[PDB]
Amino acid sequence: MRDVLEVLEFPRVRALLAERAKTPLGRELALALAPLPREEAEKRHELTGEALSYPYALPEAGTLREAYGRALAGARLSGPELLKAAKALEEAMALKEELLPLKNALSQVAEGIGDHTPFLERVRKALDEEGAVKDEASPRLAQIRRELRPLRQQILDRLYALMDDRFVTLRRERYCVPVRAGMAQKVPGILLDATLFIEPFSVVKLNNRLQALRLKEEEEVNRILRDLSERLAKDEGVPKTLEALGLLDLVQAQAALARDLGLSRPAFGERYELYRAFHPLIPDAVRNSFALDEKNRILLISGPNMGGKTALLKTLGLAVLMAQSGLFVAAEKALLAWPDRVYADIGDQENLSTFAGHLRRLREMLEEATSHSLVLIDELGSGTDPEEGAALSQAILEALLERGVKGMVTTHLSPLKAFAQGREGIQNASMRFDLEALRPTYELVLGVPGRSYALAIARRLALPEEVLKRAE
Amino acid sequence: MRDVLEVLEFPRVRALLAERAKTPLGRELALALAPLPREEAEKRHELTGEALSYPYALPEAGTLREAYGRALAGARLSGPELLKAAKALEEAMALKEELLPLKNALSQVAEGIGDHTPFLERVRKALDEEGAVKDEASPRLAQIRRELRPLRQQILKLNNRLQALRLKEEEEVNRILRDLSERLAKDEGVPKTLEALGLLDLVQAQAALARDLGLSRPAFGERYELYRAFHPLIPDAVRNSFALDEKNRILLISGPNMGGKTALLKTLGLAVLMAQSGLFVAAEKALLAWPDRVYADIGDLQENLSTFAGHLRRLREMLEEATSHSLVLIDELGSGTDPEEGAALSQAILEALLERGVKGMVTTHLSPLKAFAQGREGIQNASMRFDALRPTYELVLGVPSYALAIARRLALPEEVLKRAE
Numbered sequence: 001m002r003d004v005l006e007v008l009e010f011p012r013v014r015a016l017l018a019e020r021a022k023t024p025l026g027r028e029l030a031l032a033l034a035p036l037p038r039e040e041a042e043k044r045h046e047l048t049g050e051a052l053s054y055p056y057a058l059p060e061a062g063t064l065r066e067a068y069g070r071a072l073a074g075a076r077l078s079g080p081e082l083l084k085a086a087k088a089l090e091e092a093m094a095l096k097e098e099l100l101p102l103k104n105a106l107s108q109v110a111e112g113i114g115d116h117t118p119f120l121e122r123v124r125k126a127l128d129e130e131g132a133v134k135d136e137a138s139p140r141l142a143q144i145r146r147e148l149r150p151l152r153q154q155i156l157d158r159l160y161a162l163m164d165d166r167f168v169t170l171r172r173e174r175y176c177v178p179v180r181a182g183m184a185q186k187v188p189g190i191l192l193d194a195t196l197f198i199e200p201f202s203v204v205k206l207n208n209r210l211q212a213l214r215l216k217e218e219e220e221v222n223r224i225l226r227d228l229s230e231r232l233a234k235d236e237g238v239p240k241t242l243e244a245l246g247l248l249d250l251v252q253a254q255a256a257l258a259r260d261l262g263l264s265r266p267a268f269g270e271r272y273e274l275y276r277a278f279h280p281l282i283p284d285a286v287r288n289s290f291a292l293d294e295k296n297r298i299l300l301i302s303g304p305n306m307g308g309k310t311a312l313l314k315t316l317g318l319a320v321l322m323a324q325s326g327l328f329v330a331a332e333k334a335l336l337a338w339p340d341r342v343y344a345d346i347g348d349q350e351n352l353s354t355f356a357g358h359l360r361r362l363r364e365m366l367e368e369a370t371s372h373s374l375v376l377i378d379e380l381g382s383g384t385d386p387e388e389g390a391a392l393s394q395a396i397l398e399a400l401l402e403r404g405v406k407g408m409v410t411t412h413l414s415p416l417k418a419f420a421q422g423r424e425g426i427q428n429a430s431m432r433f434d435l436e437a438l439r440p441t442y443e444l445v446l447g448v449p450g451r452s453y454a455l456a457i458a459r460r461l462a463l464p465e466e467v468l469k470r471a472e
Numbered sequence: 473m474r475d476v477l478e479v480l481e482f483p484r485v486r487a488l489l490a491e492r493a494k495t496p497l498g499r500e501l502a503l504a505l506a507p508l509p510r511e512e513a514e515k516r517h518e519l520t521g522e523a524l525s526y527p528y529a530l531p532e533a534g535t536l537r538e539a540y541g542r543a544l545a546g547a548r549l550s551g552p553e554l555l556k557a558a559k560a561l562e563e564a565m566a567l568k569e570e571l572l573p574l575k576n577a578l579s580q581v582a583e584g585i586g587d588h589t590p591f592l593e594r595v596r597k598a599l600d601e602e603g604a605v606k607d608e609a610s611p612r613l614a615q616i617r618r619e620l621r622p623l624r625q626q627i628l629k630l631n632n633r634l635q636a637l638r639l640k641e642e643e644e645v646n647r648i649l650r651d652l653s654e655r656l657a658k659d660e661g662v663p664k665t666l667e668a669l670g671l672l673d674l675v676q677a678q679a680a681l682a683r684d685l686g687l688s689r690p691a692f693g694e695r696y697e698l699y700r701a702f703h704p705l706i707p708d709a710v711r712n713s714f715a716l717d718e719k720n721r722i723l724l725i726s727g728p729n730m731g732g733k734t735a736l737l738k739t740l741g742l743a744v745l746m747a748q749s750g751l752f753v754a755a756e757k758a759l760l761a762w763p764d765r766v767y768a769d770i771g772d773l774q775e776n777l778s779t780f781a782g783h784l785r786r787l788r789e790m791l792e793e794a795t796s797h798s799l800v801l802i803d804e805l806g807s808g809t810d811p812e813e814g815a816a817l818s819q820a821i822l823e824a825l826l827e828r829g830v831k832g833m834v835t836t837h838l839s840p841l842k843a844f845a846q847g848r849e850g851i852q853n854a855s856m857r858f859d860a861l862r863p864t865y866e867l868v869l870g871v872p873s874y875a876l877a878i879a880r881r882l883a884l885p886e887e888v889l890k891r892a893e
């Protein structure tokens with residue numbers, strides 16, 4: 001289900017991916033990315049590589065979507081709100097003509113970008129660069145504008161007989177002048193705290209036939225803006241265009257992730273072989289390279305935690321899940337097969353109700369894992385009795401080697417190190433320690449178990465030499 | 473070093489004790505509480521015992537101290553503020569009259585209360601029930617005051633000066649309570665009285681601590697024998713009991729995490745620290761030794777190379793600097809690294825310490841270590857046991873199980889492969 005994407009911190013990979021979307025359309029798709037059918041995932045891989053090859057820009061799709069959705073509901077869209085949507089459609093078509101001569105997988109997506117010309121040429125006639133509605137837009141408005149602009153110069157007009165302050169302003173959307181202490185008639189807008197904002201008697205009557213022509217201004221503009229909105233809504237090209245951008249935004253981010261982290265195109269075969277692989281979320285991550293195949297199914301990692309043990313289990317699993325999701329994956333080169341189910345046993349320490357939780361996941365593996373399934377097991381046999389737990393831990397390893405699963409196990413149990421020798425299909429490996437430098441490395445040593453650390457600490461630490469006392 | 477005080481959460485034990493001070497003076501002592509010379513230790517139970525037997529109450533010393541501060545700085549002390557210091561000084565002497573006749577070690581502490589009679593009769597003649605200044609205070613202020621006897625009411629910015637006799641009056645007053653502030657400063661038992669009061673506050677709190685947490689009264693000896701001990705800081709603590717003697721010196725407490733095992737170590741050693749500090753230990757009956765040093769090897773949860781190299785740095789100390797009178801608390805021995813060298817080193821540390829004849833208590837997870845511990849001079853296997861997958865958390869001496877059947881109680885397949893030969 002989930003609980004494998006959760007365990008492997010896949011949503012953090014989604015979080016990084018959506019940070020590199022340029023629209024919410026891409027952002028949403030990244031936040032719901034998940035393992036795909038194999039043809040889709042490779043097609044996402046091929047798309048990602050080619051968007052590395054030729055970068056492209058995007059509209060603000062999503063402002064386009066939000067305007068279009070409001071049009072479908074039958075909002076009366078704002079002028080610039082139409083204009084901003086109109087430009088995004090215009091850039092979407094322009095991107096399509098940019099992308100088609102590439103004649104490759106980017107172009108095939110871009111073929112979904114519609115012909116939005118009839119909406120555009122409506123818009124370019126209708127409204128100007130600022131989103132206000134032109135005189136051109138209907139003839140009915142043009143007569144209104146022709147009867148309005150000259151009337152607005154009355155009042156121009158501007159009488160003196162001064163003593164008044166300055167200017168001409170309009171209050172309550174009717175023209176007026178400021179005056180102090182006079183002797184000039186009529187009907188006051190507001191007052192000061194001197195101004196008194198006068199609305200002379202002479203120019204009341206032809207104020208109302210400017211308010212009248214104002215009410216016709218909206219009554220023909222709010223006809224036009226609605227009609228432009230319905231022309232946007234009744235444009236069947238926009239979904240298939242919006243679908244196309246959300247890919248192109250997502251596939252832009254699925255590549256810009258790989259540029260930014262060091263990710264690569266995997267290929268799918270019948271066995272895993274990673275070349276300098278690492279955890280995407282670990283900064284400056286140490287690069288390591290292994291291979292699991294039908295001869296060497298299960299890789300048993302013997303470990304001074306905290307020196308790499310759990311990160312590799314997440315490193316393998318996260319590369320596979322990103323691969324199945326169409327993401328580029330965290331290697332110099334990656335060859336992974338395609339498990340029917342990943343099984344992850346990883347914690348959230350280490351006594352004995354961790355161990356029950358470890359058993360609870362392993363039982364799920366023991367019942368319904370096939371030879372095609374990939375198993376990650378952390379802290380096998382720890383948290384519990386080292387004697388009885390060792391026999392159980394071998395008992396579960398035998399169950400899965402006979403089962404033909406592939407995957408990776410981390411354990412501390414020395415009786416399990418002796419078991420990975422001499423038993424076909426499981427192999428030992430460890431994590432290096434510069435015990436001289438008193439650090440983990442975090443390299444990986446294939447073939448070599450987590451051999452002996454404890455004495456060599458002591459000599460650097462100035463313990464008595466009457467001790468040691470070495471049994472062996 | 474007392475690192476080990478910090479390690480064993482001793483300042484938390486101080487924090488409870490200082491909470492039950494009735495004065496700042498006792499509160500300061502409790503936060504300063506240290507392991508003691510043994511006579512003062514064995515004394516301070518005889519006080520903490522008897523101050524349970526005969527409880528008392530204490531004055532507002534501190535406010536005695538701080539006001540007697542400001543009259544060593546020589547403020548003109550406030551009118552009530554001198555009365556309050558006097559009230560404690562009187563209230564301090566009621567203790568000495570009350571705490572003398574029982575003759576106990578409680579009584580010898582009361583013998584440092586001063587004979588503050590000369591101060592108090594100066595107070596009592598001068599200044600009143602309310603902290604005002606009265607006529608009685610002097611030849612001067614009994615006059616001057618009487619006098620001030622006005623005339624008024626002549627009726628059916630009023631002339632008659634305005635108060636140009638009356639408004640003179642004044643200052644007068646001190647002098648007398650500046651003299652009494654100096655008399656407070658120069659009184660020759662006051663620092664000794666404050667020492668006696670603060671100690672009785674400290675003993676009072678320690679008596680309250682004993683009742684509140686269920687504490688009892690160690691006796692010291694040449695071997696440990698703890699009887700239903702527990703941890704004073706673990707609420708509803710399970711009780712447990714053992715002996716470290718010369719015969720059985722070291723208790724190798726096997727057993728799992730969460731557990732018990734890391735906090736028996738604190739249970740023993742904090743009782744030892746709490747005893748050596750003249751306090752009441754966390755047990756029904758407890759018999760203890762007086763170790764020259766207590767070494768704790770306790771950390772700071774999952775167990776590393778770096779914790780182990782931390783742990784190895786404290787076993788270096790014990791191997792270098794522990795005698796047969798030492799008490800060692802060693803945690804998670806050989807946890808951290810491979811079992812392979814991890815045991816063969818951890819054994820050799822045990823042998824060196826069983827040779828050295830220290831007495832202590834160890835927690836490990838190494839299987840070979842508990843097959844070493846069966847068959848040796850004095851070292852014994854214990855465990856905390858386990859339940860419903862619960863821990864209990866009660867010791868079992870003798871006894872280092874249970875890796876399967878978690879599995880069968882989860883009903884895995886079978887897959888048994890119970891062949892653990």
Ligand SMILES: Nc1ncnc2c1ncn2[C@@H]1O[C@H](COP(=O)(O)OP(=O)(O)O)[C@@H](O)[C@H]1O
Pocket residue numbers: 282283284285286287303304305306307308309310311312442
């Ligand atoms: N290859 C690596 N590169 C960088 N850091 C790593 C690497 N592997 C592990 N780490 C560090 O170790 C932690 C992961 O725990 P890890 O050591 O893998 O599990 P375990 O404690 O079981 O060995 C992370 O916080 C990370 O910082």
Ligand SMILES: Nc1ncnc2c1ncn2[C@@H]1O[C@H](COP(=O)(O)OP(=O)(O)O)[C@@H](O)[C@H]1O
Pocket residue numbers: 702703706707708709710711728729730731732733734735736865
């Ligand atoms: N005697 C006890 N009574 C009640 N609770 C205890 C007791 N001993 C330990 N605990 C509980 O166990 C916790 C300490 O863990 P601990 O058992 O010391 O770990 P470990 O199993 O590694 O020794 C404490 O939080 C405490 O609540």
Ligand SMILES: [Cl-]
Pocket residue numbers: 122126137224227228
């Ligand atoms: Cl139109």
Ligand SMILES: [Cl-]
Pocket residue numbers: 719848849850851
């Ligand atoms: Cl014996």
Ligand SMILES: [Cl-]
Pocket residue numbers: 880886888
């Ligand atoms: Cl069975």
Ligand SMILES: [Mg+2]
Pocket residue numbers: 305309310378379
């Ligand atoms: Mg781990």
Ligand SMILES: [Mg+2]
Pocket residue numbers: 420421427428447448
């Ligand atoms: Mg090998």
Ligand SMILES: [Mg+2]
Pocket residue numbers: 733734804
């Ligand atoms: Mg512990």
Ligand SMILES: [Mg+2]
Pocket residue numbers: 762763764797
């Ligand atoms: Mg001694």
Ligand SMILES: [Mg+2]
Pocket residue numbers: 466467469820823824
């Ligand atoms: Mg030796």
Ligand code: NA
Pocket residue numbers: 009281282
């Ligand atoms: Na991580």
Ligand code: NA
Pocket residue numbers: 035339340341342
């Ligand atoms: Na899967």
Ligand code: NA
Pocket residue numbers: 523524527528676679680
């Ligand atoms: Na009391």
Ligand code: NA
Pocket residue numbers: 680684
């Ligand atoms: Na009390």
Ligand code: NA
Pocket residue numbers: 384385386726727728837
């Ligand atoms: Na155990």
Ligand code: NA
Pocket residue numbers: 703705706735738
């Ligand atoms: Na505790």
